[PDB]
Amino acid sequence: GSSGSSGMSVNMDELRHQVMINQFVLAAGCAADQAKQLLQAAHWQFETALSTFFQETNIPNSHHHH
């Protein structure tokens, strides 16, 4: 009940993203298209995305057959 406010001032939503992608691409050094995919496929979680991307060939195997 009762909605907050939402929207205050011009936000660099896109900018940030764009910058991020490039960054993530620079930080890592992969294709630019990857960034988006990664980010998007990582909720735009640079930290994580980067963490994962970096350690791709190494997943926290474990599973737990139900």
Side-chain angles (χ1 to χ4, degrees):
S2 217
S3 74
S5 182
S6 168
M8 233 85 150
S9 53
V10 292
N11 59 68
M12 65 216 264
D13 191 358
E14 259 92 288
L15 244 63
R16 200 276 239 86
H17 139 216
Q18 226 232 346
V19 173
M20 257 175 41
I21 280 175
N22 204 340
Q23 268 195 99
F24 197 95
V25 176
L26 269 169
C30 265
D33 235 59
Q34 284 293 287
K36 194 144 145 117
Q37 309 240 357
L38 266 59
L39 281 163
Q40 227 184 22
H43 347 94
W44 302 82
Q45 295 313 267
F46 203 105
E47 293 248 319
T48 296
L50 222 70
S51 200
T52 286
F53 157 77
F54 267 128
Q55 63 119 47
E56 254 213 328
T57 53
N58 246 303
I59 60 140
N61 209 4
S62 239
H63 259 264
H64 225 59
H65 95 105
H66 194 291

XYZ file of all heavy atoms in Angstrom:
509
model
N 0.823 -1.197 0.000
C 0.000 0.000 0.000
C 0.867 1.261 0.000
O 1.999 1.241 0.480
N 0.302 2.328 -0.545
C 1.009 3.596 -0.614
C 2.337 3.415 -1.353
O 3.270 2.814 -0.822
C 1.253 4.167 0.784
O 1.121 5.586 0.811
N 2.379 3.947 -2.566
C 3.577 3.851 -3.383
C 4.586 4.921 -2.959
O 4.205 6.047 -2.642
C 3.244 3.995 -4.868
O 2.927 5.341 -5.217
N 5.852 4.531 -2.967
C 6.918 5.442 -2.587
C 6.812 6.761 -3.355
O 6.000 7.620 -3.011
N 7.641 6.881 -4.381
C 7.650 8.082 -5.200
C 8.029 7.728 -6.640
O 7.286 8.031 -7.573
C 8.617 9.125 -4.637
O 8.608 10.327 -5.402
N 9.184 7.095 -6.776
C 9.671 6.698 -8.086
C 9.880 7.935 -8.963
O 8.955 8.720 -9.165
C 8.703 5.726 -8.762
O 9.012 5.535 -10.140
N 11.101 8.069 -9.459
C 11.443 9.197 -10.310
C 11.729 10.447 -9.475
O 10.849 10.944 -8.774
N 12.963 10.918 -9.577
C 13.375 12.101 -8.841
C 14.033 13.123 -9.769
O 13.604 14.274 -9.834
C 14.361 11.698 -7.742
C 13.906 12.221 -6.379
S 12.744 11.081 -5.646
C 13.074 11.371 -3.915
N 15.065 12.666 -10.464
C 15.786 13.527 -11.386
C 16.419 12.690 -12.499
O 16.477 11.464 -12.401
C 16.859 14.338 -10.656
O 17.721 13.509 -9.881
N 16.877 13.383 -13.530
C 17.503 12.718 -14.660
C 18.539 11.715 -14.146
O 19.450 12.083 -13.406
C 18.097 13.755 -15.614
C 16.995 14.566 -16.299
C 19.079 14.673 -14.884
N 18.365 10.468 -14.559
C 19.273 9.410 -14.150
C 19.970 8.837 -15.386
O 19.345 8.658 -16.428
C 18.517 8.271 -13.463
C 17.460 7.675 -14.393
O 17.760 7.051 -15.397
N 16.208 7.902 -14.004
N 21.257 8.566 -15.226
C 22.047 8.017 -16.315
C 21.934 6.491 -16.360
O 22.941 5.789 -16.298
C 23.514 8.416 -16.135
C 24.101 7.784 -14.872
S 25.253 8.911 -14.105
C 26.785 8.302 -14.788
N 20.698 6.025 -16.467
C 20.441 4.596 -16.520
C 21.204 3.988 -17.699
O 22.045 3.109 -17.511
C 18.952 4.312 -16.726
C 18.538 2.853 -16.527
O 19.446 2.038 -16.257
O 17.323 2.585 -16.652
N 20.885 4.479 -18.887
C 21.530 3.996 -20.096
C 23.041 4.225 -20.019
O 23.821 3.279 -20.109
C 20.937 4.662 -21.338
C 19.942 3.734 -22.037
C 18.516 3.980 -21.538
O 18.243 3.585 -20.384
O 17.734 4.560 -22.321
N 23.408 5.487 -19.852
C 24.812 5.852 -19.762
C 25.553 4.808 -18.926
O 26.439 4.119 -19.429
C 24.961 7.281 -19.235
C 25.598 8.287 -20.196
C 24.738 8.474 -21.445
C 25.881 9.615 -19.490
N 25.164 4.723 -17.661
C 25.781 3.775 -16.751
C 25.994 2.430 -17.449
O 27.110 1.914 -17.484
C 24.917 3.564 -15.506
C 25.741 2.978 -14.358
C 25.849 1.457 -14.481
N 25.297 0.811 -13.269
C 23.999 0.528 -13.094
N 23.112 0.833 -14.051
N 23.588 -0.059 -11.962
N 24.905 1.900 -17.986
C 24.959 0.625 -18.682
C 26.064 0.662 -19.739
O 27.043 -0.075 -19.645
C 23.591 0.267 -19.267
C 23.652 -0.326 -20.654
N 22.694 -0.075 -21.620
C 24.566 -1.161 -21.226
C 23.026 -0.734 -22.720
N 24.186 -1.408 -22.474
N 25.869 1.530 -20.722
C 26.838 1.673 -21.795
C 28.260 1.685 -21.230
O 29.109 0.908 -21.664
C 26.564 2.936 -22.615
C 26.632 2.641 -24.115
C 27.566 3.624 -24.826
O 27.957 4.647 -24.288
N 27.900 3.258 -26.059
N 28.474 2.572 -20.271
C 29.778 2.695 -19.642
C 30.191 1.338 -19.068
O 31.310 0.880 -19.295
C 29.750 3.805 -18.589
C 31.053 3.834 -17.788
C 29.473 5.165 -19.235
N 29.267 0.734 -18.336
C 29.521 -0.561 -17.728
C 30.036 -1.562 -18.765
O 31.157 -2.057 -18.651
C 28.231 -1.093 -17.101
C 28.244 -0.910 -15.582
S 26.674 -1.408 -14.895
C 26.364 -2.877 -15.861
N 29.194 -1.829 -19.751
C 29.550 -2.762 -20.807
C 31.016 -2.552 -21.193
O 31.856 -3.416 -20.948
C 28.580 -2.635 -21.984
C 27.276 -3.386 -21.702
C 29.236 -3.094 -23.287
C 26.263 -3.166 -22.827
N 31.277 -1.400 -21.794
C 32.627 -1.066 -22.217
C 33.612 -1.440 -21.108
O 34.577 -2.163 -21.347
C 32.765 0.433 -22.486
C 33.908 0.712 -23.463
O 34.798 -0.096 -23.665
N 33.833 1.900 -24.059
N 33.334 -0.930 -19.917
C 34.184 -1.202 -18.769
C 34.430 -2.706 -18.636
O 35.559 -3.169 -18.793
C 33.574 -0.630 -17.488
C 34.087 0.786 -17.220
C 33.780 1.219 -15.785
O 34.619 1.167 -14.901
N 32.534 1.647 -15.604
N 33.357 -3.426 -18.347
C 33.443 -4.868 -18.190
C 34.263 -5.494 -19.321
O 34.983 -6.468 -19.104
C 32.014 -5.411 -18.252
C 31.865 -6.834 -17.712
C 31.487 -7.035 -16.421
C 32.111 -7.898 -18.522
C 31.349 -8.356 -15.920
C 31.973 -9.220 -18.021
C 31.594 -9.420 -16.730
N 34.127 -4.909 -20.502
C 34.846 -5.398 -21.666
C 36.327 -5.035 -21.534
O 37.196 -5.807 -21.935
C 34.207 -4.849 -22.944
C 34.999 -5.278 -24.180
C 32.743 -5.278 -23.053
N 36.568 -3.860 -20.971
C 37.928 -3.386 -20.781
C 38.566 -4.135 -19.610
O 39.688 -4.626 -19.718
C 37.948 -1.864 -20.623
C 38.120 -1.059 -21.913
C 37.855 0.428 -21.669
C 39.499 -1.301 -22.530
N 37.822 -4.199 -18.514
C 38.301 -4.879 -17.323
C 38.698 -6.312 -17.684
O 39.759 -6.785 -17.283
C 37.223 -4.828 -16.239
N 37.823 -6.962 -18.438
C 38.069 -8.331 -18.857
C 38.940 -8.326 -20.115
O 40.126 -8.645 -20.055
C 36.734 -9.046 -19.075
N 38.317 -7.961 -21.226
C 39.020 -7.910 -22.497
C 38.386 -8.862 -23.513
O 39.088 -9.479 -24.312
N 37.065 -8.950 -23.449
C 36.328 -9.816 -24.354
C 35.515 -8.936 -25.304
O 35.645 -7.714 -25.289
C 35.442 -10.806 -23.594
S 36.321 -12.398 -23.383
N 34.693 -9.593 -26.110
C 33.858 -8.886 -27.065
C 32.910 -7.950 -26.314
O 32.540 -8.221 -25.173
C 33.110 -9.897 -27.937
N 32.543 -6.867 -26.985
C 31.645 -5.890 -26.394
C 30.246 -6.497 -26.273
O 29.528 -6.227 -25.311
C 31.656 -4.612 -27.235
N 29.898 -7.304 -27.265
C 28.598 -7.951 -27.282
C 28.466 -8.856 -26.055
O 27.378 -9.001 -25.500
C 28.432 -8.821 -28.530
C 27.200 -8.502 -29.381
O 27.113 -7.344 -29.840
O 26.375 -9.425 -29.552
N 29.591 -9.442 -25.668
C 29.614 -10.328 -24.517
C 29.142 -9.585 -23.265
O 28.271 -10.069 -22.544
C 31.010 -10.920 -24.309
C 31.290 -12.032 -25.322
C 30.390 -13.243 -25.069
O 30.565 -13.993 -24.124
N 29.417 -13.390 -25.966
N 29.740 -8.423 -23.045
C 29.391 -7.609 -21.893
C 27.874 -7.637 -21.694
O 27.380 -8.227 -20.734
C 29.928 -6.190 -22.089
N 27.177 -6.992 -22.618
C 25.727 -6.935 -22.556
C 25.183 -8.308 -22.158
O 24.585 -8.459 -21.093
C 25.154 -6.406 -23.874
C 23.685 -6.012 -23.714
C 23.351 -4.786 -24.565
C 21.925 -4.871 -25.114
N 21.098 -3.763 -24.583
N 25.410 -9.276 -23.034
C 24.950 -10.633 -22.786
C 25.250 -11.039 -21.342
O 24.349 -11.440 -20.606
C 25.582 -11.614 -23.775
C 25.409 -11.129 -25.215
C 24.614 -12.141 -26.043
O 24.249 -13.209 -25.581
N 24.367 -11.746 -27.289
N 26.519 -10.922 -20.980
C 26.949 -11.273 -19.637
C 26.125 -10.481 -18.619
O 25.353 -11.059 -17.855
C 28.460 -11.079 -19.490
C 29.322 -12.319 -19.739
C 29.105 -12.862 -21.152
C 30.797 -12.025 -19.459
N 26.318 -9.170 -18.642
C 25.603 -8.293 -17.730
C 24.127 -8.697 -17.693
O 23.617 -9.098 -16.649
C 25.830 -6.828 -18.109
C 27.162 -6.219 -17.665
C 27.454 -4.926 -18.426
C 27.192 -6.012 -16.149
N 23.485 -8.577 -18.845
C 22.079 -8.925 -18.957
C 21.834 -10.332 -18.407
O 20.814 -10.583 -17.768
C 21.600 -8.812 -20.406
C 20.281 -8.042 -20.489
C 19.745 -8.023 -21.923
O 20.075 -8.861 -22.747
N 18.903 -7.025 -22.173
N 22.787 -11.211 -18.675
C 22.689 -12.586 -18.214
C 23.253 -12.686 -16.796
O 23.465 -13.784 -16.284
C 23.414 -13.507 -19.197
N 23.482 -11.524 -16.201
C 24.018 -11.467 -14.851
C 23.323 -10.344 -14.078
O 23.899 -9.775 -13.153
C 25.536 -11.280 -14.912
N 22.095 -10.060 -14.487
C 21.316 -9.015 -13.844
C 22.121 -7.715 -13.822
O 21.845 -6.823 -13.020
C 20.862 -9.456 -12.451
C 21.044 -10.931 -12.184
N 22.172 -11.448 -11.571
C 20.229 -11.991 -12.451
C 22.032 -12.762 -11.480
N 20.828 -13.098 -12.025
N 23.100 -7.647 -14.712
C 23.947 -6.470 -14.805
C 24.815 -6.412 -13.547
O 25.204 -5.332 -13.105
C 23.109 -5.206 -15.011
C 22.227 -5.241 -16.261
C 21.026 -5.817 -16.409
C 22.528 -4.648 -17.542
N 20.534 -5.641 -17.685
C 21.476 -4.907 -18.397
C 23.652 -3.917 -17.965
C 21.443 -4.471 -19.727
C 23.605 -3.489 -19.298
C 22.553 -3.741 -20.170
N 25.095 -7.588 -13.005
C 25.910 -7.685 -11.806
C 27.393 -7.753 -12.177
O 28.010 -8.814 -12.086
C 25.500 -8.892 -10.960
C 24.078 -8.725 -10.421
C 23.880 -7.334 -9.815
O 24.052 -7.115 -8.628
N 23.511 -6.408 -10.696
N 27.922 -6.610 -12.588
C 29.320 -6.527 -12.973
C 30.187 -7.424 -12.086
O 30.803 -8.373 -12.570
C 29.752 -5.072 -12.782
C 30.966 -4.669 -13.620
C 30.802 -3.890 -14.724
C 32.209 -5.088 -13.263
C 31.929 -3.515 -15.502
C 33.336 -4.713 -14.042
C 33.172 -3.934 -15.144
N 30.207 -7.093 -10.803
C 30.987 -7.855 -9.844
C 30.849 -9.355 -10.121
O 31.833 -10.026 -10.426
C 30.573 -7.522 -8.410
C 30.948 -6.083 -8.051
C 32.062 -6.052 -7.003
O 31.988 -6.883 -6.072
O 32.962 -5.199 -7.157
N 29.620 -9.834 -10.005
C 29.341 -11.241 -10.238
C 29.746 -11.637 -11.658
O 30.601 -12.500 -11.847
C 27.860 -11.485 -9.938
O 27.736 -11.201 -8.547
C 27.475 -12.962 -10.053
N 29.112 -10.986 -12.623
C 29.396 -11.259 -14.022
C 30.906 -11.420 -14.210
O 31.362 -12.407 -14.786
C 28.817 -10.138 -14.889
N 31.640 -10.435 -13.712
C 33.089 -10.455 -13.818
C 33.632 -11.688 -13.091
O 34.419 -12.447 -13.653
C 33.681 -9.135 -13.318
C 34.829 -8.558 -14.149
C 34.325 -8.053 -15.503
C 35.576 -7.472 -13.373
N 33.189 -11.846 -11.852
C 33.622 -12.973 -11.042
C 33.404 -14.280 -11.805
O 34.321 -15.091 -11.931
C 32.877 -13.007 -9.706
O 33.562 -13.792 -8.733
N 32.184 -14.445 -12.296
C 31.835 -15.641 -13.044
C 32.647 -15.718 -14.338
O 33.463 -16.622 -14.510
C 30.322 -15.627 -13.278
O 29.771 -15.952 -12.004
C 29.859 -16.768 -14.186
N 32.397 -14.756 -15.214
C 33.096 -14.704 -16.487
C 34.559 -15.123 -16.327
O 35.034 -16.012 -17.032
C 33.044 -13.252 -16.967
C 34.149 -12.885 -17.960
C 34.058 -13.285 -19.257
C 35.221 -12.158 -17.545
C 35.083 -12.943 -20.178
C 36.246 -11.817 -18.467
C 36.155 -12.217 -19.764
N 35.232 -14.464 -15.396
C 36.631 -14.757 -15.134
C 36.833 -16.246 -14.838
O 37.681 -16.893 -15.449
C 37.036 -13.946 -13.903
C 37.653 -12.584 -14.230
C 37.162 -11.457 -13.648
C 38.692 -12.501 -15.103
C 37.736 -10.194 -13.952
C 39.265 -11.238 -15.407
C 38.775 -10.111 -14.825
N 36.039 -16.742 -13.901
C 36.120 -18.142 -13.518
C 34.998 -18.941 -14.183
O 34.147 -19.509 -13.501
C 36.075 -18.296 -11.995
C 34.739 -17.804 -11.434
C 33.994 -18.934 -10.721
O 34.549 -19.669 -9.920
N 32.711 -19.032 -11.055
N 35.035 -18.960 -15.507
C 34.032 -19.680 -16.273
C 34.252 -21.189 -16.150
O 33.376 -21.911 -15.679
C 34.042 -19.242 -17.739
C 32.829 -18.364 -18.057
C 32.354 -18.588 -19.494
O 33.225 -18.881 -20.341
O 31.130 -18.460 -19.713
N 35.428 -21.620 -16.582
C 35.776 -23.029 -16.526
C 36.062 -23.451 -15.084
O 37.165 -23.899 -14.772
C 36.954 -23.265 -17.474
O 37.924 -22.303 -17.066
C 36.630 -22.878 -18.918
N 35.051 -23.295 -14.243
C 35.180 -23.654 -12.841
C 33.910 -23.243 -12.094
O 33.840 -22.150 -11.534
C 36.363 -22.930 -12.195
C 37.454 -23.922 -11.785
O 37.231 -24.854 -11.031
N 38.644 -23.668 -12.323
N 32.936 -24.142 -12.110
C 31.672 -23.886 -11.442
C 31.666 -24.593 -10.084
O 32.382 -25.572 -9.887
C 30.500 -24.279 -12.344
C 30.555 -25.766 -12.700
C 30.446 -23.393 -13.590
C 29.159 -26.390 -12.667
N 30.826 -24.054 -9.160
C 30.718 -24.621 -7.826
C 29.914 -25.923 -7.849
O 28.887 -26.033 -7.179
C 30.066 -23.534 -6.988
C 29.413 -22.581 -7.975
C 29.962 -22.894 -9.358
N 30.409 -26.875 -8.624
C 29.750 -28.164 -8.742
C 29.345 -28.654 -7.351
O 30.030 -28.378 -6.367
C 30.685 -29.207 -9.357
C 29.894 -30.266 -10.129
O 28.685 -30.190 -10.275
N 30.641 -31.253 -10.613
N 28.232 -29.372 -7.312
C 27.728 -29.903 -6.057
C 26.425 -30.668 -6.298
O 26.331 -31.855 -5.991
C 27.507 -28.786 -5.036
O 28.272 -28.987 -3.851
N 25.452 -29.955 -6.847
C 24.158 -30.552 -7.134
C 23.615 -31.229 -5.873
O 24.293 -31.276 -4.848
C 24.251 -31.506 -8.326
C 23.740 -30.922 -9.621
N 22.452 -31.132 -10.082
C 24.357 -30.133 -10.547
C 22.311 -30.494 -11.235
N 23.493 -29.876 -11.522
N 22.396 -31.735 -5.992
C 21.754 -32.407 -4.874
C 20.478 -33.100 -5.357
O 19.373 -32.647 -5.065
C 21.498 -31.429 -3.726
C 21.876 -31.967 -2.366
N 23.159 -32.380 -2.054
C 21.127 -32.152 -1.241
C 23.170 -32.795 -0.795
N 21.909 -32.654 -0.294
N 20.675 -34.187 -6.089
C 19.554 -34.948 -6.615
C 18.447 -35.026 -5.561
O 18.695 -35.427 -4.425
C 20.010 -36.325 -7.099
C 19.853 -37.421 -6.072
N 18.848 -38.371 -6.140
C 20.580 -37.707 -4.954
C 18.975 -39.187 -5.103
N 20.048 -38.774 -4.370
N 17.250 -34.639 -5.976
C 16.105 -34.660 -5.082
C 15.674 -36.107 -4.836
O 16.511 -37.006 -4.777
C 14.972 -33.790 -5.630
C 13.886 -33.491 -4.623
N 13.015 -34.458 -4.152
C 13.540 -32.326 -4.004
C 12.186 -33.889 -3.289
N 12.513 -32.567 -3.199
